[PDB]
């Protein structure tokens, strides 16, 4: 049995739609408190709907878990996280860290408990409310350090804390810290001088700094995605360029110039040599990460000359591009890179995540 599902948040309405990615039919629509940004767990078993303006994070059991596969209907869980302006969500190996821009704490919990209907939260102090990020580790977390002076500015680095908020090592200064992603056993935080790279073995997590290569043009990264199946990061580097970073090689950086400005990007979790960038001209661009170049482009929507704009997700052998102003999802074959289908979604379909796979029953 093969099963994949899309989870789509409306830009304005407090709704999340669940769509069977394979035939387009609707599986559920969930009503939440506010418009949501969506994240999935690594296992794909839970979906989190972050509602910045409503002070809540809702949780969805996706209904697909695992090889052997167990398939149920998707369901809104009664577990909700509460706090002012929920922010960056980071999940790793079933450990969850939910940041709150308006709180003195981040909330750490575990996927296994969430799915069982349990809410077992550890609040870790982050010194001062700010727009930051928490990465969960075994018996530790990495949390951004709020800007001294103001604190409403971007954070100035990160540090290891134990789960009582106590600092462990020394601070890792990274001015203008913004942007985070995991790829394999390595987690990256971007800032004005480069990337913080985080790994954990059997002790405290270890942070090291990778400066932007001296050969790059002036610029820095403020958003990151992480490869799945091959270890790398993709960041923005100015509005019309991206950088590919290999954190395991000394020749770390490759710059790609886009023809027009970036709207969104995602990696391909199935064909790990590829990633995808959507640009304001309305094209989907295939990034061959090994060669460091755009290998092809295809027009998918009308231009969105830089509020809602398309978002990409990948499921099985298909790519899904939300077209909010046209109340639909465009579906392309990943291999041929051609449109094959469209799926209607009422309203302004915006953020999108996909889960699934295959297993015996």
Numbering used by the authors: 33 to 98, 105 to 344, 350 to 404
Copy text from the publication.
We have recently identified a periplasmic protein AztD in Paracoccus denitrificans, which is able to transfer zinc to the cluster A-I SBP AztC23. Here, we describe crystal structures of AztD homologs from P. denitrificans (PdAztD) and Citrobacter koseri (CkAztD), a pathogen of the carbapenem-resistant Enterobacteriacea group.
Indeed, although the crystal structures of apo and holo CkAztD are very similar overall (RMSD = 0.22–0.44 Å), residues 99–104, including zinc ligands His101 and His104, could not be modeled in three of four chains of the apo structure. In the chain where these residues could be modeled, they were displaced from their positions in the holo structure. In contrast, very little structural perturbation occurs for ligands to site 1 when zinc is absent.
